[PDB]
Design an enzyme around this catalytic site. Structure first.
Site, PDB file in Angstrom:
ATOM      1  N   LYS B  75       0.787  -1.467  -0.225  1.00  0.00           N
ATOM      2  CA  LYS B  75      -0.285  -0.143  -0.009  1.00  0.00           C
ATOM      3  C   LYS B  75       1.047   1.704  -0.049  1.00  0.00           C
ATOM      4  CG  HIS B  98      -9.836 -17.006  -0.151  1.00  0.00           C
ATOM      5  ND1 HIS B  98     -10.292 -18.231  -0.099  1.00  0.00           N
ATOM      6  CD2 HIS B  98      -9.220 -17.002   0.870  1.00  0.00           C
ATOM      7  CE1 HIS B  98      -9.423 -18.841   0.921  1.00  0.00           C
ATOM      8  NE2 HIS B  98      -9.817 -18.216   1.742  1.00  0.00           N
ATOM      9  CD  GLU B 135      -8.290 -30.700   0.819  1.00  0.00           C
ATOM     10  OE1 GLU B 135      -8.768 -31.578   0.040  1.00  0.00           O
ATOM     11  OE2 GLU B 135      -7.064 -30.376   0.662  1.00  0.00           O
ATOM     12  CG  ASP B 164      -5.568 -26.329   0.001  1.00  0.00           C
ATOM     13  OD1 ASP B 164      -6.334 -26.376  -0.119  1.00  0.00           O
ATOM     14  OD2 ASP B 164      -6.035 -26.789   1.359  1.00  0.00           O
ATOM     15  N   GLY B 243     -10.736 -50.487 -10.009  1.00  0.00           N
ATOM     16  CA  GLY B 243      -9.714 -50.385 -11.583  1.00  0.00           C
ATOM     17  C   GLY B 243     -10.520 -51.792 -12.279  1.00  0.00           C
ATOM     18  N   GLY B 244      -9.851 -52.343 -12.831  1.00  0.00           N
ATOM     19  CA  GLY B 244      -9.806 -53.734 -13.624  1.00  0.00           C
ATOM     20  C   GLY B 244      -9.863 -54.888 -12.013  1.00  0.00           C
TER      21      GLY B 244
END
Lengths: 412, 412
Positions: B75, B98, B135, B164, B243-244
């Site tokens: 400033k 933010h 988060e 994060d 998954g597989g």
């Protein structure tokens, strides 16, 4: 125009998720990624969890866009000769085989500029060095399972691919850093990444809590404080904030039937007043028992219950629309269905529509980060051995030689 | 010797986790990271979750090693002049404020080579663009919460910092790619990364399952198949493989008291025979109802229950020692306590001991990936404004000027 990895050539032996996630990114950044696959078989993802008979599974197309494919038999003499030619011209070689003759030594000899990238389940000096690892095996060994879920429930596995894609992104980081390094040493190098370390890295904050626990014997912001009990290790905290700002998963209208009718609500320390206003509890602004986070902790769940009395009353999306007016950090729990149809995620390039030969359209997650100087063009995944001929031609082989190699392979 | 980012200068305004995780890595790769902080306040992590009175919290020291710190009032006129001098000499500027006058336009004007890195909760075109995110807010909006946990339980948050650190690693990838790009365009650029996209990227496989579900109406490998019910969206699958290769969290001796007395067990398709041998079920090798994954799915939990009959019998570590002899992919659920004391993780550099002024020793997660051509040296985190004078001197300011600036600030 120009591309970040423009001109970079990658030799890609990876399969499944961790490795393929890494090289898919390399391709989107402009590198020529050549997927080297077993003849007639190829990446297992090609045939796992198929939704359509006989064509490459979404498991494959979503982790192999913009890549080229060659079928190569490294055992033959022809294959051995092709391999060395590839290694000599390549910038990067990547593999993520399970623990179980081009050695790293011979490779530097052949190409002193080559960067070798390797993903394994565990570090070289780890006692689990030879243990096979799949997504969740790494999550258990990395500390994630232990600290995910509820205190009165079993260790919980995470939907996020902490052990694969996450490991892939970590290797990607290493590869890019090695390219930057090569710019100064004029030499390539070896870059390794284990799935266990990948998981552990994302759980950095839990090691922080472990040290606070070893020192104090309790964790002030955890649900077990102060009426519960703490053991020797960081416990599961359900849907707790996980940091310096308390939060929880609150039910919204329809939760009894809709598993996703919920929102995440954060009690931000500096937003306490607006929070009180949002929920009609002005008295809580000055009440000593609520004016401070330290004072709220002991009965923080009564606060979540009070807020939930309002949230179960409306649709999660109106709750967020209402609450954010008071600058409260919150968002609805979006299902994969909602995400797959979100317009903005389409507009932002997060969810990308791709035309795949034989299949038609499918959705995939695009390039996560956005660049102002370049925009990746996400394309279809390659059919098995689709670029075998093209690559051999680029290596200087004649049409007769290419034909002979395929014929010998047919006979063999 | 040489370092990957040797000579790179970073202007770091990040706070909390996402941004700091990224720049901590930049520093470990050799860059000079200058943390710019508010005078007298600094990064909130400095004072959140302290375990020791009045000194920087572990939250801070574990995300800010090897960084330098300057206290700067943007400033003032003095601060404004210092800022522009910093921007002119910098390679990278990072912030993760933010949603709520050096503009991107003015910055290119000042330094055409500068790369601007920005982390936000949501993409620019997102309807949540102005919503604050922590988060778990990102985990809910990204699809993780929705698909993590049990089908008869609420959406579950993950211990891993999907919103994060994960976002930090993604930005890191972008920054490194932009450095590689600058090598060809001679120009810097803007790189953005949202926490929502970070989470979504790790949940790529869930978007695959969503498409299979939209097409077939069921997910063969999920616990809901074939006796349960499927909705319009991918459901939570508890501790399923994801998954597989099927898997589950099995109780081991001591589970009633020890929350971490468990292992993750994977039923690998090609390791079925060895599995049968490990558990004394040779008959299952040829039994039609068990010889195939497709055949096992319908009653796969009876198989997990049979295996668990053995695991609850011994310590998780002997179970793994026994089972891996049959090449079964498995590992114990390691607690943060076990991880903090693991010798190999110390030897591999995964868990690193660091001497911090005023505090003494603390543990931190080291550089995840390993390089053969360079080894990072993890050091202490900086005290607030510790390098303010040094940096101003480097900018060409005299001792009298530096003294005057501090005096004006003292008076103001």
């Amino acid at each position: 125009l120009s591309t970040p990895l423009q001109g970079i050539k990658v030799l890609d032996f990876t399969g499944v998720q961790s490795g393929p996630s890494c090289t898919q990114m390399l391709a989107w950044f402009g590198a020529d990624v050549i997927k080297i696959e077993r003849p007639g078989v190829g990446d297992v993802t090609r045939h796992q969890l198929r939704d359509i008979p006989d064509i490459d599974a979404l498991y494959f197309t979503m982790l192999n866009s913009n890549k080229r494919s060659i079928e190569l038999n490294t055992k033959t003499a022809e294959g051995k000769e092709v391999m060395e030619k590839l290694i000599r011209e390549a910038d990067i070689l990547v593999e993520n085989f399970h623990p179980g003759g081009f050695t790293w030594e011979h490779i530097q000899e052949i190409n002193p500029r080559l960067i070798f990238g390797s993903i394994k389940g565990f570090d070289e000096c780890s006692p689990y060095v030879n243990v096979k690892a799949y997504e969740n095996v790494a999550q258990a060994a990395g500390g994630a399972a232990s600290t995910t879920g509820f205190w009165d429930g079993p260790p919980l596995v995470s939907a996020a691919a902490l052990g694969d894609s996450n490991t892939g992104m970590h290797l990607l980081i290493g590869l890019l850093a090695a390219l930057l390094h090569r710019e100064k040493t004029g030499r390539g190098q070896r870059v390794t990444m284990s799935m266990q370390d990948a998981v552990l890295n994302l759980c950095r904050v839990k090691l922080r809590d472990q040290q606070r626990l070893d020192k104090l014997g309790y964790l002030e912001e955890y649900p077990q404080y102060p009426n519960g009990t703490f053991g020797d290790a960081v416990p599961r905290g359900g849907n707790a904030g996980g940091g310096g700002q308390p939060g929880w998963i609150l039910k919204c209208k329809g939760w009894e039937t809709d598993p996703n009718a919920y929102i995440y609500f954060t009690i931000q320390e500096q937003n306490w007043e607006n929070t009180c206003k949002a929920i009609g509890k002005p008295e809580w602004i000055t009440d000593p028992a609520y004016s401070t986070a330290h004072a709220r902790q002991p009965h923080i769940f009564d606060i979540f219950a009070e807020i939930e009395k309002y949230t179960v009353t409306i649709d999660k999306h109106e709750a967020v629309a209402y609450l954010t007016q008071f600058d409260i950090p919150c968002a609805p729990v979006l299902s994969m269905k909602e995400i797959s149809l979100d317009p903005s995620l389409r507009q932002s390039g997060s969810v990308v529509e791709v035309e795949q030969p034989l299949r038609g359209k499918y959705l995939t997650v695009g390039c996560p980060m956005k660049f102002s100087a370049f925009t990746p063009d996400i394309k279809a995944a390659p059919l098995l051995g689709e670029h075998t001929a093209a690559v051999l031609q680029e290596l200087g082989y004649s049409d007769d030689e290419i034909a002979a190699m395929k014929q010998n392979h047919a006979i063999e």
